[PDB]
Amino acid sequence: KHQGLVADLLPNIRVMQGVGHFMFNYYSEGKKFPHRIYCIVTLLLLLLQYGMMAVNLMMESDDVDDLTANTITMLFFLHPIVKMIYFPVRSKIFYKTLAIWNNPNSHPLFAESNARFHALAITKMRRLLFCVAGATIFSVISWTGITFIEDSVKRITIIPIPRLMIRTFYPFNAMSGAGHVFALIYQFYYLVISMAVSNSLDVLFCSWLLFACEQLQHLKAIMKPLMELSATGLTKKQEMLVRSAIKYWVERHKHVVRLVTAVGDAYGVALLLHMLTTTITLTLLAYQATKVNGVNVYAATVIGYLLYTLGQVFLFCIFGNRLIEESSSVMEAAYSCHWYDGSEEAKTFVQIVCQQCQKAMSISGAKFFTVSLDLFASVLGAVVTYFMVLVQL
Amino acid sequence: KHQGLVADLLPNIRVMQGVGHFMFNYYSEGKKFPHRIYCIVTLLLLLLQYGMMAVNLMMESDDVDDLTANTITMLFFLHPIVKMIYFPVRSKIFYKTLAIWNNPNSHPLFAESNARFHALAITKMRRLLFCVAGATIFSVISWTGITFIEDSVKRITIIPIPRLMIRTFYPFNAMSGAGHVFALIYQFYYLVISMAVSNSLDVLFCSWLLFACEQLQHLKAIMKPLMELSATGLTKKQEMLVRSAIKYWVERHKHVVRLVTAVGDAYGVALLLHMLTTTITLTLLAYQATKVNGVNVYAATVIGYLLYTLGQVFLFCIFGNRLIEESSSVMEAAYSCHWYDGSEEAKTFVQIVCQQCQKAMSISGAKFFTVSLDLFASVLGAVVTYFMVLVQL
Amino acid sequence: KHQGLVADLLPNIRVMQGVGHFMFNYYSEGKKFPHRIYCIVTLLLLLLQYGMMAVNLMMESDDVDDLTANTITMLFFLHPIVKMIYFPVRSKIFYKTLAIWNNPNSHPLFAESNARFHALAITKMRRLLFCVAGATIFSVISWTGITFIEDSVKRITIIPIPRLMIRTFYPFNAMSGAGHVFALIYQFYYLVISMAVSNSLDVLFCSWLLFACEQLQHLKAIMKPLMELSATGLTKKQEMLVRSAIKYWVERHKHVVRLVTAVGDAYGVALLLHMLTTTITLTLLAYQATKVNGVNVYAATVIGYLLYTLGQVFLFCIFGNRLIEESSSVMEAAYSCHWYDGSEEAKTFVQIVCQQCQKAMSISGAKFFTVSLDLFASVLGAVVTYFMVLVQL
Amino acid sequence: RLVLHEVRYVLMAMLYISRGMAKQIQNSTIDLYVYWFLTFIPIASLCVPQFTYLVVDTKSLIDFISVLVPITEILLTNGKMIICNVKRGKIINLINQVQVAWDECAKSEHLEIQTLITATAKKTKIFVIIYTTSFLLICVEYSSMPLFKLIYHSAVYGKQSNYTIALPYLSRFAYSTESTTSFAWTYFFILLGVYLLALTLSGFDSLFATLVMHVKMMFKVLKFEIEQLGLDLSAGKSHVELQAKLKQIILKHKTNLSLIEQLEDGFSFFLMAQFLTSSILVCVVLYELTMVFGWNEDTFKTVTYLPGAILQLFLFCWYAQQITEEARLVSDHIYNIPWYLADPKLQKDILTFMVKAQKPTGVTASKFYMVTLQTFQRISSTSYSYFTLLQTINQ
16 A cells, blocks of 8 residues: 555555455455455355345246346346456456556656646546545435335236335345345345445546556656757757656656556456446346336336446446547647757657557457447447337337 | 478368368378379268258258258358368469468577577467367267257157258168168268368468467567667677668568468458358348247257357457457557667667558458458347347347 | 550540540541530430330339339439439549640659550550440340340239330330330340440549559559669769659659549549439349349349449449559558668658558548448448348338 | 638627627627526527427327427527537637738738638638528528518408417417517517527537638648748758748648647537437438328428438538548648658658648547548438338338
């Protein structure tokens, strides 16, 4: 919890540890033992509820609509389990990534901009974490309220059904007795924990991306005065200064590239699994939306599911796209200085940088796609087209 | 069987010859005559069996389900026939490709890296060949077992049908007598030979691609010390040494480009035909999967067909994608050296290499598409969408 | 006739003028007045037949299938009329294009190569024309052939319909000897003239593209001895010789670029209108193919329509794709020479040429799209997808 | 002088800017708040009543869609009002920079630049006039048709006319309108809102197109300067003079790139919302036409709603295409000079110039895509595919 890129992200690491995202790496060994059991317990509880959910879906397969709703719930709550199991297996690469920026470069002339942009990155990371936490809390409260404003009823004739936030089969009578209140408490805990683990892993990915983008911003900001330093014939000392500045710029850019590659390594398969689950979720959600008539509870539930799913996709796409834009705009930043007035070394450096910048940095979901607003647009178009085809038929 | 790129692929060549892929080029002429007849015989038998399958299609056209199954089988077994005929007509370009790496360049400083990466390439080719052979054997065994676990019955009333591994029409009574065992043996041989020929040609293509990729890796690994060789002004001996190293690097890169172009010329039309057959196979398979209900034999057969087809496509796509990725990453490797400390010739060499690497090497199916994981993703999405539409209708 | 690019294309120009394609530019003034009259008459005749077809469409609109057939024929025969009217209005730009290569560059060292490639171009052009001519003739014959092997009958009861090659309404009897013979002769003339004018304009476009591609081939071929001339410190005479060679190369490349730009300006709107018509043609043709059930005449007619339409599109796309490929191969060939042994001017020339060639030459349908095999693939995929949806529904 | 003169007039007529005719327009908060207050007028007079009628009084899907199309157009126009009010500062700074560039160019001693200047001024004036006049005519006719009907009926049939006047649009208000005073005041506010919306549409579309025209003129001036550098190369002038001339050319290129950047920054969200709404409206109207195909009165309304949408899309697509095309052609212009006659250093500077000039530079739609003519082609293709698939799947 000391070296760079772990001190900056320490609040997010603490959230993830608190919810149960393992990570037995960033505290004193004294807490190493107890926390572990807590994690296991949480996992077990999750699985328990998940299993008790799946069992319900087995006897809810007589009809199609209830089957569709149960399947959507199961996929939505499969996301967090997949993420929670995914992290520990790849903890090696995750810890390699979190220790990438422990020993960065330094130059006297660019220390001030470096510090300014580091602080800006930290502030942006904290803001993102708080915003996502607020969204998660709002979603939990909305679920816990909608489960009460509506009416619990089963259509066959009318048959009362236990009023619970998540449909589930329980060995006990979870209708009116203390089993009812126990079930509500357990389901509330399940909702909070699942949403927390999923969104916290997503936020860690996005925070890595934000740090990379801010480092690119600093690189451009110092690109502006680097040429002025070169422009000025020149004495040996000035030539050495230009060489050192160019070395600093190139090495910092290479460091940013290393960080981006490590982030991709760490999270590509997670992105692929997320999108695979999403696809089916969105298909079922389009079928469900085909049945909406009015502004009743059903519409609220369908819109909530669609909004949460597309919001996760949209966060990923936003930050991938921002990385792409900064990496590309490096060239514009390099062109707008007085490169024609510099020395031969500076002009060649600008040339090579401009050649390099033609390809934008990006994160690929296991080489099957890249995260960007184009991906979000394609997903949205596909779901809209499928919904139109459904409604026409 | 002595010169480079044939000593490396020699197990592949021997397997291809043994299965009956003509190719009367890489043994003592004394064996040229016998082997030839063997090849012809195989083809005849293949076609013979193939014909008797098509005949069975004609009298099974009363219904649509049997017609669909017969057409799927016919295309699946059309693949190997097309490949077997395709090789001899284009054999000249194949032999030209296999002799392309007979006289590569050599530099004292980069000999160890070249040897290491050549050995790595050879090991990877051997691993790929063994894995593909194992998959082929597994498929053959699965077919031969599933034909027996299931029940041979035809529906009108219930009509017993011969228990054969492939639906076929035979002039004799291939149900109980020696005809039954003869048909079983003949069909086992047919399956083995067809799968072997198809997969062996594909594995040769993939081995070419692996060799190219490993050569690119060697190029990057040696690019790292080349600049340091230039950086140090330089005495005339040093300039000659840098010129020699740059000449070596550029010539080796051009050689890899030549090899990639030769592979593309050799196999583009084969890729086009393969995907043309696949398209219809996958369409019919989606229609068939629409009829699955349970975990009975039918589901197993359909899933196996889809798995095999998508596996062929996936193999092609993964190796094409690897070629693209290595060719692109050459630019990153060129940027990441210490060029800012090098001389002017080295810097111009870096600039030109980056310009060249702006575009990535790839293999196209007769300019009608490129083989990459994007193609596999598009195929998978198309089949999934068609299935969804079919179930909706 | 005595100037380049109109001497080479003279057979195409003569064919165009012969079929009535205006272009009163390339003969003695004595023939100016007669030829014009002929052209007008042809157009008149064309339009008259067209009108006589449209009237029939009015009385064959109550039914839906014959409406589709009539609409397909009307669009097919719309293509030639649009091309015929299009040429004269834009004749100025066509004449500007045909006069591009009247005064080209020349260098003593690269003369021989130039001549060879020039000769090559002419040969290819001739071949193309002949091939297309053959195809055109074949189509006509096939058309006539079918019109006599099928049975001329209309379903209401069976009513005998006049046996003509095109469904049309005529004031004449159109069934007795005189009217039937006149209708047959007139419709044969119509078919020949329409196909000839359309394909002649198309072939002119494709021949322009062929000439451009061969010029690019010449530049790539001669780029090697240019560098070897640079490589050798040089004396003044060698510097001047290298400068003259570089000037020749760059000027010829710019001339090719100008030719491509002029071709695009001349033919963009023609391509746009062609594809606009072809889209509706292919939609109606997919609906028509939905009704094929093995009958010789109907299946043959539908397959002929589809083949002709896709063949026109394919010709345009293939020649555009060849242009793009040659443009990029220019960079590829600029790389593969002994620049590392050259001087500063030669290396800078290589760098600038490669940078310029990073963007490929292309022809766009008035900037609404690009003509390449990708466009043909898109058209084919759209028609196939629509057909599949239609058959499933 | 005063680039975008007619645009300044039309903006002033909208109270968007009170001192438009100044050489350096000023952004004053008074205009901001006045324009916000004006923006709230059409919302209350047009948007809310029409939306209420759509939600409540509609009885069938056909009526729903027919009422939905015009309401969607009005909502889009109000969104344009709000977006441009928000981007006021950037838009005004862009206009000021364009004016500065034009003033710098107008001091030229070369007849070619003067001809370019005159052609650009004439083009902008004519385009603004035609577009604004046509849209004002359309909106005024649509709004005031019943007023003219009343006047004509009163004049012809006197007091015996059996004609009762109604508001120009199908809408429902919170209060009654049977009273003459309320009816008159609501009618006046409806006309005020319609006038504001029409001026918004015309003025902002004209501003986008005219800024594109001026950027194109600047690119042509850059082309002229590049050609002059080529002539100086042929004439064989010393190295320092060629360096200076190339430096000036690069500075001009940077200025033009800055102008494109400002235009994109100011109009990205405008274009995104425009394209989204137009495409969705096209799909909806195609569906409606399919449901009511054949000879009848309903088809007329859809046939009228379409062309406005298609032409509005085409305008933006065409001018974004022009921006991209010129930015690209800079590379050809710089390649065509006799650079091989210059010593290697100037050739390397030209190489960096060319590397920058080749990058696709244009105007994006909220960064989702770059707007060009291919965007219109894609929208048209999707519309046609949707139409055909709808017809087939119908039965």
